[PDB]
Amino acid sequence: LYFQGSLELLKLRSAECIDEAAERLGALSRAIWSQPELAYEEHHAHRVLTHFFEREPPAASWAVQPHYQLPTAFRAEWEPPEARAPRPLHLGFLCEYDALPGIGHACGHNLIAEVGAAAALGVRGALEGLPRPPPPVKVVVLGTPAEEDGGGKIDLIEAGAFTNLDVVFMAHPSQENAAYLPDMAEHDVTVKYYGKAYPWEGLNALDAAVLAYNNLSVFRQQMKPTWRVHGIIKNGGVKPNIIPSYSELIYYFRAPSMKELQVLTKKAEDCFRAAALASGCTVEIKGGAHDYYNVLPNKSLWKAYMENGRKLGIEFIGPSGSTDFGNVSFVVPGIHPYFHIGSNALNHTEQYTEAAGSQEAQFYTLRTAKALAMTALDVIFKPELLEGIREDFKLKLQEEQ
Amino acid sequence: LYFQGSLELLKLRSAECIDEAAERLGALSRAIWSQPELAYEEHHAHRVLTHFFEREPPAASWAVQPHYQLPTAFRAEWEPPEARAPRPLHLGFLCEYDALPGIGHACGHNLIAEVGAAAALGVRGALEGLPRPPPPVKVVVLGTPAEEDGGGKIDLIEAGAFTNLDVVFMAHPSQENAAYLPDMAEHDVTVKYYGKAYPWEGLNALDAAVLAYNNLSVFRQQMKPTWRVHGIIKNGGVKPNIIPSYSELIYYFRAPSMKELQVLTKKAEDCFRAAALASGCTVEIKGGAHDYYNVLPNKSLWKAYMENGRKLGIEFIGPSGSTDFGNVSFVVPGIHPYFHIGSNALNHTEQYTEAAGSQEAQFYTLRTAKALAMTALDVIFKPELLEGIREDFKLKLQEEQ
Amino acid sequence: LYFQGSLELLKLRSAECIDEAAERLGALSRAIWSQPELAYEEHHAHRVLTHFFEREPPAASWAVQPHYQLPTAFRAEWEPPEARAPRPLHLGFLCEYDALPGIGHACGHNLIAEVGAAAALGVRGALEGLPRPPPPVKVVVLGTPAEEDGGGKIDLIEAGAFTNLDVVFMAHPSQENAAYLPDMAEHDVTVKYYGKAYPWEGLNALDAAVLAYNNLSVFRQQMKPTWRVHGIIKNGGVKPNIIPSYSELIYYFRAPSMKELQVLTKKAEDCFRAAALASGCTVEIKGGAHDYYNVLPNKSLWKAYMENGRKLGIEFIGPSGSTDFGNVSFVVPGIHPYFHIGSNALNHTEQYTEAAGSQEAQFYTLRTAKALAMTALDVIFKPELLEGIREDFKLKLQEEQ
Amino acid sequence: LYFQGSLELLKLRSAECIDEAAERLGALSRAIWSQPELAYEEHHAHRVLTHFFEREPPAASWAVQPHYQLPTAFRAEWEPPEARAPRPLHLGFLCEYDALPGIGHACGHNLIAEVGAAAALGVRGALEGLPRPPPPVKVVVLGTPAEEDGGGKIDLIEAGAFTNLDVVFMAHPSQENAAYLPDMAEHDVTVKYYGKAYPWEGLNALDAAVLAYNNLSVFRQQMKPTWRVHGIIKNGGVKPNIIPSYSELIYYFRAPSMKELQVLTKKAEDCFRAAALASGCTVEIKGGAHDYYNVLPNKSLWKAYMENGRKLGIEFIGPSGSTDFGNVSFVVPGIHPYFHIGSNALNHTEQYTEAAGSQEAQFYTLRTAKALAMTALDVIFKPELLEGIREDFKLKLQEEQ
Ligand SMILES: N[C@@H](Cc1c[nH]c[nH+]1)C(=O)O
Ligand SMILES: N[C@@H](Cc1c[nH]c[nH+]1)C(=O)O
Ligand SMILES: N[C@@H](Cc1c[nH]c[nH+]1)C(=O)O
Ligand SMILES: N[C@@H](Cc1c[nH]c[nH+]1)C(=O)O
Ligand code: NA
Ligand code: NA
Ligand code: NA
Ligand code: NA
Ligand SMILES: [Zn+2]
Ligand SMILES: [Zn+2]
Ligand SMILES: [Zn+2]
Ligand SMILES: [Zn+2]
Ligand SMILES: [Zn+2]
Ligand SMILES: [Zn+2]
Ligand SMILES: [Zn+2]
Ligand SMILES: [Zn+2]
């Protein structure tokens, strides 16, 4: 309540500290939105975000590590400069910023960078505005490039960037406010067929591509209704007067779990290899470098986030049904809420790029950032919540194993 | 020429002996045409043909063996009753008589029985009307049922009925007069798919049938243009509300040689097994009991037959592109000429049944029978022709091996 | 409460009246379960159910109409014999009883007949055990044959059997207790292709069936994930040596609404007609006599039923995702709850036939019948519930239009 | 015979005049073979061939028209400079020279240019070496670019280049010597599908391409065995995460006649439009600018050419089963013999490029050129042959109409 230094007063300070930084946070959003960059090519966004945390007053109070493990990734850390002779809490906030080809930031990833920077700013301000000994906490900001292709979070996982985080937060703009939305696991694959080019002495690799297409097509009747299979024939011949000795298909499969994705992938391999057997061609089946994991929910973290958004005016009920945050949620307890930004346009469409950079979207972005910061304060000052977050994380991890 | 007992005079007697038997040979044709019977069910035709050779005067001069190896097959033999203390010539004439379902004798097999009986009658009469010692010859008539399905000639081959024949003759009515027409090799197959019948827990055997159909369909572009593949989906499900756990296809393949038929059959097996792999079903691939061989030609026998038909007024240029006579031609030198019967209708059509039983067809049938009988006389009295027939048979046999 | 003639006391009497009839209701179940009969062939079940209501004491107090509109359908009615010089309430209870081929009553329809007869018995006993003037109510039992094929309820709808009913009740055994489960709309179709049977002069009707199969197969990627399409190739040729001039497919489509089912059906027609265009065959597309409607829920009726089952010990969370009760729910407000019967077996499986006729299933059947009877008493004595049932019915009807 | 100025002596002079020019004709072949150029890009070959006829002694005795109608086409004409106050004979010889991409002159078109230039040289020398009045003849050489793609002869036909020719000659190197080989008619087509890119709101243009492929594939069973259909999927999608709204196929069809090609093309259009109907996409079907005609034979011209090659030592028994000479043969009586060049390699293969430029091929090229020149002399001095050539041309033209 009104009591001296209550948790309610700290959550207020975090909201006021975000409102005070509304101007430069909006400039951060515009800087990324105006210069859209693709996966692993976000050099300007990396410059903009690293400079942002460097200039945060007092300068160098955020320990910033540019080019952290990836050329466009970065890492910024803050803790209250104090000690007393007992493990500190590590709270992580992620910033995405890569855009889509041709249409710009049609996923509103400029707002994801803004909302992750704002939440970390609000947490520090709430702890800064605390007298007495502040509890041991380290605020960690991680710039994770290449969400839309590659999986920069996975590259960071392989570098050990998430091994010492206790909780991780981010948020993603969408069409409705939901503390959790089902993002599925994904496996990418490239299929190449090789034949030999008098057509009686011919192995038709284009036949193999079409037969593979037919094999998967009739299989759709027996897929679990939650499964997804989409693919194209990238290469289906060059000239009609020569038997195509080469064909190439590119597919990706999605299932709500790693176990179900393995069954779907084996079923697809059977379809690809059957096309080789029927056509006489040889086949190479090459999976992508990284499989995307489904996002594990965290019940305790979820319920605490919803209670904070309710006080803020958020009414609760994604874009791509898979994200590399799923790999993160498998190693660190996290939440990935989606938030409405004042538009009816769909993600990955041109009209969403308009909404992502609009002035109307800034209110919804900064409001959701406030909810993330207050939820982070909840974990800091409620040990029973932190244990409940860990129990929910351990239980969910056993089922998915 | 006019000389006492010339080969020209013997060929005339064979023609006169056939003309004299025109009445009862036509009755033989009508008896089979009027009561059409299917493969291995030709009990009446067997009765009619056995009685025919039994009543040939003097009675029992034809040694007739009814129910020879097959219930509806038979065997009739004649030789001049004389000896002198040096291997005799065995000349075979085949009679087919099985009809087609529904449309009757749309292949004119009633005329095949007539033409084989007439040729053997003409040969005996030409030798009967010879004074002095007649050369050692045995005229053998073989009733071969089930040409249109099963291959009764093959059943007779397995009984050793052709192991002591030197030359074999028959003729088949068609649309044009040709001393030889390309009949191909054939392999029949029945394909059965087995799945398991909540459709996510389903193996769709109907998918396997359709995928097998697609696999063979695109393969048609790479088949040799002389190859043929035809098939049906005999069983493709029973009720739509149950995943079909069983499917059944029936196919036959044709190629001009045994070697090429093996390549086509292996290619088809790959298509059938690929459908099993793509659908998850198991597959049984069951070939027919008998493969049909292509008909080997005999150049010497061919040229001698054409020279005899030319003197008779026949002008030279089939129904099913495969016949069990091909298996016979592989073990005995033979000819299988086709002859026009005064009709434009196609074989295996209702309007050919009309032509096969017409009065107009009797002249063309008895004329071709005359050509067969004279050709048989050529082999009897020209040792240089018999050796040339055997050399052509040995050479053709090596290529097809 | 304990008050003289409370609604709570009437619900108790209905439960006691059902418990008293447990013996003969179980005999009713066994009589139908032991002699399984198919759609429109349920002559014995019709005899058993009509005799049941005739012998209910005092005899002829149930006005029974055998062979009502359908040969195996029936109608039984009861009202308190009294008047006073104001429209009476008509409450309907449905009895299903047709079984499945081969596996018997694998849907537990013997229990559906029992539960509908028991609920109507319990309502009459609760009203019988009421002194003073009883409110004007007519209990109507309708025997609806051919649920699993045909749609006997639709035949009864066309006879006007539901035009004077205010509320209608039934229940269906399943795996879990749910006051409502999504049953979809369904449209059946039979597709026939006609060609012309020298294969160059051939229209292949089997090609049309396979091409239609392929057209629908690739369409599955673009169907709404709630849609369902299942079909078979009933006729795909007779002999491989003749081009198939005829083919036949049987399909059914399911969508959660009539509007969505029309879009799916037009899309399928495009696939069927495209196969005709590609093959050159003509096509006949014949829809089933009756389309099945999706089941409209009724919120007020639903919530009242759940509150009654809770007092009975039922814990709340189908077989065929479509039923002719959906057509009934479109013209009369109704509920179609599913109830667990002590088994893990799935509907339409052999092991569910075991559960449907077991002694263990009688407790769950009679318990759910008690819940139906108490819910019927709620409608009789709560005018605010009846109006709320009608408002929910009118609102739901506008959306589905 | 030996008589003063016999036709036999003129044919000898034509052979001696070709033998004398063997050196510079071989240089002509090497100049084109060493610098392979593609359709309509044969600038160097045009320079080489125009300069060849310009430098033929006496210079400018060949009236050469460079850049004739096409940039790389040309025209050279010679006649004996004399008059007398009765229509002259126009004899045409064609030179091809365009090569194949990547593999060079794998069709030996360098030899086609050489053989057409040599035959025209031999004819002029035979007429030059004639005293007295020479009959009125004009030797016309036409450079026809872009045989392997485009049809430069057709461009020349549209300019009227063949309207005043009486007979036309060329020759094409192959594997065996044949005065005529069946080259078929050809029709090219490009098929484009347009859809609309939430996959439930999607028209899949890749489905249209695959369905079109399946439609044509099953059609192969019913094509006439002389027909040919080959095609590729040039564009079958770009990224798997977007429904392909565009697809592109490229096909060509071949039939032995224009009438049969029209039936095959309509059947293919039905397959392409059916894919549009099944997928919901719109389709554009665009045929090539020029259809290729089948080559009409000329019996009289054929028999005269074979009699000349026999005297030369040629023993008689193509690459692409269609050529733009077929369009020429439809408007001018012509022959297009194929000739062996000392190699077993196949046309359009790398090893044929080796043979085309070898020293071994020069003897066979110059020998066939001698046969063309003598055949041209036959037409000049046998009026009964010229009339027979025209009667055969008129009769063959009526059947193909
Ligand atoms: N198929 C998507 C999946 C995805 C990952 N991140 C965003 N989208 C891709 O191309 O990467
Ligand atoms: N496929 C044909 C082949 C044949 C053999 N004999 C006559 N026809 C069959 O059913 O037997
Ligand atoms: N497809 C099912 C649908 C159904 C209606 N009732 C029960 N099941 C049928 O054959 O009728
Ligand atoms: N399909 C061949 C046909 C052809 C014409 N000339 C030579 N080849 C082409 O691409 O042109
Ligand atoms: Na600011
Ligand atoms: Na007689
Ligand atoms: Na009782
Ligand atoms: Na020279
Ligand atoms: Zn995105
Ligand atoms: Zn995104
Ligand atoms: Zn036949
Ligand atoms: Zn036959
Ligand atoms: Zn059922
Ligand atoms: Zn049921
Ligand atoms: Zn070429
Ligand atoms: Zn060429």
PDB file of N, CA, C and O in Angstrom, chain B residues 180 256-257 294-300 302 329-330 332-334 388-401:
ATOM      1  N   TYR B 180       3.271 -62.834 -90.487  1.00  0.00           N
ATOM      2  CA  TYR B 180       3.810 -62.660 -89.147  1.00  0.00           C
ATOM      3  C   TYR B 180       3.437 -61.271 -88.651  1.00  0.00           C
ATOM      4  O   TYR B 180       3.472 -60.304 -89.416  1.00  0.00           O
ATOM      5  N   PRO B 256       8.609 -56.146 -76.069  1.00  0.00           N
ATOM      6  CA  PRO B 256       8.871 -57.043 -77.208  1.00  0.00           C
ATOM      7  C   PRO B 256       9.837 -58.181 -76.911  1.00  0.00           C
ATOM      8  O   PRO B 256      10.030 -59.035 -77.785  1.00  0.00           O
ATOM      9  N   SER B 257      10.447 -58.232 -75.729  1.00  0.00           N
ATOM     10  CA  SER B 257      11.382 -59.305 -75.423  1.00  0.00           C
ATOM     11  C   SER B 257      11.305 -59.632 -73.940  1.00  0.00           C
ATOM     12  O   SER B 257      10.806 -58.844 -73.133  1.00  0.00           O
ATOM     13  N   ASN B 294       7.148 -63.536 -76.208  1.00  0.00           N
ATOM     14  CA  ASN B 294       6.975 -62.997 -77.545  1.00  0.00           C
ATOM     15  C   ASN B 294       7.156 -64.109 -78.576  1.00  0.00           C
ATOM     16  O   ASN B 294       7.813 -65.123 -78.328  1.00  0.00           O
ATOM     17  N   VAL B 295       6.552 -63.916 -79.741  1.00  0.00           N
ATOM     18  CA  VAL B 295       6.564 -64.929 -80.790  1.00  0.00           C
ATOM     19  C   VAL B 295       7.843 -64.774 -81.602  1.00  0.00           C
ATOM     20  O   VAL B 295       8.056 -63.741 -82.245  1.00  0.00           O
ATOM     21  N   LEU B 296       8.698 -65.792 -81.574  1.00  0.00           N
ATOM     22  CA  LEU B 296       9.872 -65.769 -82.437  1.00  0.00           C
ATOM     23  C   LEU B 296       9.458 -66.051 -83.874  1.00  0.00           C
ATOM     24  O   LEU B 296       8.744 -67.027 -84.129  1.00  0.00           O
ATOM     25  N   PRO B 297       9.879 -65.233 -84.830  1.00  0.00           N
ATOM     26  CA  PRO B 297       9.641 -65.553 -86.236  1.00  0.00           C
ATOM     27  C   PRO B 297      10.629 -66.594 -86.738  1.00  0.00           C
ATOM     28  O   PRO B 297      11.666 -66.863 -86.128  1.00  0.00           O
ATOM     29  N   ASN B 298      10.274 -67.194 -87.870  1.00  0.00           N
ATOM     30  CA  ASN B 298      11.136 -68.148 -88.559  1.00  0.00           C
ATOM     31  C   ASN B 298      11.176 -67.744 -90.025  1.00  0.00           C
ATOM     32  O   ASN B 298      10.189 -67.922 -90.745  1.00  0.00           O
ATOM     33  N   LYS B 299      12.317 -67.201 -90.460  1.00  0.00           N
ATOM     34  CA  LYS B 299      12.404 -66.600 -91.788  1.00  0.00           C
ATOM     35  C   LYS B 299      12.120 -67.619 -92.886  1.00  0.00           C
ATOM     36  O   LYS B 299      11.342 -67.351 -93.809  1.00  0.00           O
ATOM     37  N   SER B 300      12.746 -68.795 -92.805  1.00  0.00           N
ATOM     38  CA  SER B 300      12.564 -69.802 -93.847  1.00  0.00           C
ATOM     39  C   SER B 300      11.115 -70.268 -93.910  1.00  0.00           C
ATOM     40  O   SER B 300      10.524 -70.357 -94.993  1.00  0.00           O
ATOM     41  N   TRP B 302       8.549 -68.616 -92.850  1.00  0.00           N
ATOM     42  CA  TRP B 302       7.752 -67.467 -93.270  1.00  0.00           C
ATOM     43  C   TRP B 302       7.746 -67.335 -94.790  1.00  0.00           C
ATOM     44  O   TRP B 302       6.680 -67.245 -95.412  1.00  0.00           O
ATOM     45  N   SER B 329       6.501 -70.996 -79.697  1.00  0.00           N
ATOM     46  CA  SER B 329       7.512 -70.656 -80.692  1.00  0.00           C
ATOM     47  C   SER B 329       8.922 -70.680 -80.115  1.00  0.00           C
ATOM     48  O   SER B 329       9.885 -70.828 -80.875  1.00  0.00           O
ATOM     49  N   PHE B 330       9.063 -70.551 -78.793  1.00  0.00           N
ATOM     50  CA  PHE B 330      10.371 -70.601 -78.151  1.00  0.00           C
ATOM     51  C   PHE B 330      10.926 -72.015 -78.044  1.00  0.00           C
ATOM     52  O   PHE B 330      12.140 -72.178 -77.878  1.00  0.00           O
ATOM     53  N   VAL B 332       9.468 -74.784 -80.221  1.00  0.00           N
ATOM     54  CA  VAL B 332       9.284 -75.447 -81.511  1.00  0.00           C
ATOM     55  C   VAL B 332       9.260 -74.382 -82.601  1.00  0.00           C
ATOM     56  O   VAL B 332       8.619 -73.336 -82.423  1.00  0.00           O
ATOM     57  N   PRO B 333       9.946 -74.584 -83.725  1.00  0.00           N
ATOM     58  CA  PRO B 333       9.799 -73.648 -84.847  1.00  0.00           C
ATOM     59  C   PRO B 333       8.359 -73.622 -85.338  1.00  0.00           C
ATOM     60  O   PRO B 333       7.763 -74.663 -85.623  1.00  0.00           O
ATOM     61  N   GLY B 334       7.796 -72.418 -85.429  1.00  0.00           N
ATOM     62  CA  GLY B 334       6.411 -72.287 -85.830  1.00  0.00           C
ATOM     63  C   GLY B 334       6.137 -70.977 -86.534  1.00  0.00           C
ATOM     64  O   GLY B 334       6.943 -70.044 -86.510  1.00  0.00           O
ATOM     65  N   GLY B 388      17.110 -75.151 -92.930  1.00  0.00           N
ATOM     66  CA  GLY B 388      17.036 -73.703 -92.835  1.00  0.00           C
ATOM     67  C   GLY B 388      16.064 -73.227 -91.775  1.00  0.00           C
ATOM     68  O   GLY B 388      16.281 -72.185 -91.150  1.00  0.00           O
ATOM     69  N   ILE B 389      14.980 -73.976 -91.560  1.00  0.00           N
ATOM     70  CA  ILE B 389      14.065 -73.662 -90.467  1.00  0.00           C
ATOM     71  C   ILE B 389      14.764 -73.835 -89.125  1.00  0.00           C
ATOM     72  O   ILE B 389      14.559 -73.046 -88.194  1.00  0.00           O
ATOM     73  N   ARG B 390      15.612 -74.858 -89.005  1.00  0.00           N
ATOM     74  CA  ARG B 390      16.272 -75.118 -87.730  1.00  0.00           C
ATOM     75  C   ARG B 390      17.394 -74.120 -87.473  1.00  0.00           C
ATOM     76  O   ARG B 390      17.622 -73.717 -86.326  1.00  0.00           O
ATOM     77  N   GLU B 391      18.107 -73.709 -88.524  1.00  0.00           N
ATOM     78  CA  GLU B 391      19.155 -72.706 -88.360  1.00  0.00           C
ATOM     79  C   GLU B 391      18.561 -71.366 -87.944  1.00  0.00           C
ATOM     80  O   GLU B 391      19.084 -70.691 -87.049  1.00  0.00           O
ATOM     81  N   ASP B 392      17.457 -70.969 -88.582  1.00  0.00           N
ATOM     82  CA  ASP B 392      16.775 -69.737 -88.197  1.00  0.00           C
ATOM     83  C   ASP B 392      16.243 -69.827 -86.773  1.00  0.00           C
ATOM     84  O   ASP B 392      16.224 -68.829 -86.043  1.00  0.00           O
ATOM     85  N   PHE B 393      15.804 -71.019 -86.360  1.00  0.00           N
ATOM     86  CA  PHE B 393      15.301 -71.192 -85.002  1.00  0.00           C
ATOM     87  C   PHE B 393      16.423 -71.082 -83.978  1.00  0.00           C
ATOM     88  O   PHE B 393      16.245 -70.469 -82.918  1.00  0.00           O
ATOM     89  N   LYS B 394      17.587 -71.664 -84.276  1.00  0.00           N
ATOM     90  CA  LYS B 394      18.702 -71.612 -83.336  1.00  0.00           C
ATOM     91  C   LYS B 394      19.260 -70.199 -83.215  1.00  0.00           C
ATOM     92  O   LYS B 394      19.572 -69.742 -82.109  1.00  0.00           O
ATOM     93  N   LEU B 395      19.385 -69.491 -84.340  1.00  0.00           N
ATOM     94  CA  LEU B 395      19.929 -68.137 -84.315  1.00  0.00           C
ATOM     95  C   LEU B 395      19.010 -67.188 -83.557  1.00  0.00           C
ATOM     96  O   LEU B 395      19.467 -66.407 -82.714  1.00  0.00           O
ATOM     97  N   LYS B 396      17.706 -67.241 -83.845  1.00  0.00           N
ATOM     98  CA  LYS B 396      16.755 -66.392 -83.135  1.00  0.00           C
ATOM     99  C   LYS B 396      16.718 -66.712 -81.646  1.00  0.00           C
ATOM    100  O   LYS B 396      16.469 -65.821 -80.826  1.00  0.00           O
ATOM    101  N   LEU B 397      16.967 -67.971 -81.278  1.00  0.00           N
ATOM    102  CA  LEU B 397      16.926 -68.352 -79.870  1.00  0.00           C
ATOM    103  C   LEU B 397      18.105 -67.779 -79.094  1.00  0.00           C
ATOM    104  O   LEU B 397      17.979 -67.501 -77.896  1.00  0.00           O
ATOM    105  N   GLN B 398      19.251 -67.595 -79.753  1.00  0.00           N
ATOM    106  CA  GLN B 398      20.423 -67.067 -79.061  1.00  0.00           C
ATOM    107  C   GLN B 398      20.252 -65.590 -78.728  1.00  0.00           C
ATOM    108  O   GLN B 398      20.645 -65.145 -77.643  1.00  0.00           O
ATOM    109  N   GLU B 399      19.671 -64.814 -79.648  1.00  0.00           N
ATOM    110  CA  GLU B 399      19.477 -63.388 -79.399  1.00  0.00           C
ATOM    111  C   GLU B 399      18.532 -63.156 -78.228  1.00  0.00           C
ATOM    112  O   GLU B 399      18.782 -62.291 -77.379  1.00  0.00           O
ATOM    113  N   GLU B 400      17.444 -63.919 -78.163  1.00  0.00           N
ATOM    114  CA  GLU B 400      16.454 -63.777 -77.103  1.00  0.00           C
ATOM    115  C   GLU B 400      16.909 -64.381 -75.780  1.00  0.00           C
ATOM    116  O   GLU B 400      16.122 -64.413 -74.828  1.00  0.00           O
ATOM    117  N   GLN B 401      18.148 -64.856 -75.698  1.00  0.00           N
ATOM    118  CA  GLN B 401      18.670 -65.432 -74.465  1.00  0.00           C
ATOM    119  C   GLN B 401      19.626 -64.463 -73.776  1.00  0.00           C
ATOM    120  O   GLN B 401      19.935 -63.396 -74.308  1.00  0.00           O
TER     121      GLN B 401
END
